[PDB]
Structure formats: C-alpha cells, structure tokens
Design a protein around this ligand. Sequence first.
Ligand SMILES: Cc1cc(C)nc(SCC(=O)Nc2cccc(COc3ccc(NC(=O)c4cnn(C)c4)c(I)c3)c2)n1
Ligand SMILES: [Zn+2]
Length: 290
Amino acid sequence: RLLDELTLEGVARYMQSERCRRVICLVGAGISTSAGIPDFRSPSTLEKYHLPYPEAIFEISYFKKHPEPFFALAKELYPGQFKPTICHYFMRLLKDKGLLLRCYTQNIDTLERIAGLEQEDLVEAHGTFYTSHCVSASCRHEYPLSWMKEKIFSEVTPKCEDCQSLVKPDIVFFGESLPARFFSCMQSDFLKVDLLLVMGTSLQVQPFASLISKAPLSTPRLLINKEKAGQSDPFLGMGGMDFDSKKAYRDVAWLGECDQGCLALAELLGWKKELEDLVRREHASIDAQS
Ligand SMILES: Cc1cc(C)nc(SCC(=O)Nc2cccc(COc3ccc(NC(=O)c4cnn(C)c4)c(I)c3)c2)n1
Ligand SMILES: [Zn+2]
C-alpha cells in the first residue's frame, strides 16, 4: 500500500515522496461556502412564476421558452464578492509546485480561475457562469461574465447582439449533457493520477461522484469534507470509499471545514507560510478592486 498510515500525516509523507507526482482535485460547493457562496443544493440556503415542478427553473426546455424565473434567481443568488478560499489557494500551490494534474469542479462560481487555476488545469464538470453563449445553433456568439452580469442586474433578459436570440450562461441545465471535455479528460487523467484529493462534495451528484471509481486501485484518496462521503450506500450498493473497515488501505477522511483541512495539510507539507502569504496578498488585491 502507498500510504504508511491512513491519516493526513500519512498523505503528507506520500505527497513529499517521489511516488506522488500527479494530483487530481475533485471539488464541490463545500470549498466555496467560506467565500460566502451558499450551496444552491443545501436546504438551509419563486411561486409567482408557476413552475410545473421545482427543478424546472434549471431545465433547458423550460428555460428556452421561459428564461425570466432563472434570470430572476441569478440576480438574487449573485455573490457580493468573488474572493477564493484557503482551499482554492491550496490548489494554486499544487499548480505552482507542479503537482496539479487537473481540478474537476462541480462549482460555477469561477473561484478556481480567480485563484490562479488556468483553463488547461480545470474541468468545470457542471459548466460555469464565466462565459455565456447565444443559444442559436448557427450563431453561438460568446459573451463574457461582465456582459452577462450587467444584463442580470438590469433585469433585462440577455439577447444576442448579432441575432437577438436568448444568451444562456455556460452552466449544464437539466436536459443538457456534461461537457465532452469532462469525459475525454477523465479517460486520460485517471491513467496518470497518484493522489485523489476530494474536497467539499457529498459525492451525491452523478456522473461526477463516479470519478472516485475511475482511480487506479493503488491511488490514495483523501476526503476533506464536513461529513464522511463516498462510501457505497447499503441499499443502492445492492469502487466506493473504505475509510474505517479492517480492509481499508488507501482512503482517508479528514472531517471539518475545507479551509481548516487544507491549512492542516499545507502545515504538514511546510507550505503554511507560503499559503498564508498567497491568500493575504490575493485577498488584499480583491478587497482593493471591490
Ligand atoms: C449568478 C452567479 C454568477 C457567478 C459567477 N457565480 C454565482 S455563485 C451563486 C449561485 O449559486 N448562482 C446561481 C444562480 C442561478 C442559478 C444557479 C444554479 O446553477 C447550476 C449550475 C450547474 C447545474 N448543473 C448541474 O449541477 C448538473 C449536473 N448534471 N446535470 C445534467 C446538470 C445546475 I442543475 C445549476 C446558481 N452565481
Ligand atoms: Zn446570436
């Protein structure tokens, strides 16, 4: 087995060994809650529009004929600031140290890009608000977030300047496929991965969650999350996480806030001062633009 013990300390020693060259991060809403971006799937965080069923506001067919409810929600959920968390900057340190193979994110908040991850390092599995596109097949004019934000706050349904068709944020609506990029990167990246770092996701959304089963059998998998996640469901179960059985050999659960877990791991790696300096610098820069 590649980990000398099933602890954060064991993962840190593995990461500092010659065996650990290529890290894949799988991240969800839990890496952005400390940035003041609620998880839209969280129960703790629209009747006038007459939605056939609640989830119709995120369904492609309904949105194309009735986009008003979605854009009204977009203005209400629009964050007041885009300040990446310690977890986001930890992934930037992975990139800087030549350890980041890829970051697969289920988030659409663009914090990975703001923290310094480039398009090549990223797989936005559920799409993103970073870019928007006219929905007309013969046009597909691309619009930046600055353009889409103005339309969202003005309460003007965004229309293409070339053909007057609806302009849709590049998020994956229900009824749309995950991007081709997701499947092609998964097919290549999971041949090469030395460590799977799973942070701030309950691994309940498919097919994203199934990525953990694409890791080679030897590849250590560290979960940094408020709750244990990724174990086979005893009912549905009739390559899940095994943290706590006598057969456990490679899966580690660090239970707490993603920021606290990434700080703890950075500290073990001798990166704590580097991470503090990077976060304080970027936070200062963002605060001065805000
Ligand atoms: C407006 C804005 C801009 C920026 C840059 N950040 C933010 S962060 C705050 C926020 O949550 N905003 C927000 C607003 C309106 C709607 C939504 C809903 O977003 C999404 C996204 C993807 C998905 N897709 C999946 O999950 C998924 C999976 N399989 N399939 C097939 C789809 C869904 I469903 C909903 C979010 N907000
Ligand atoms: Zn157009």
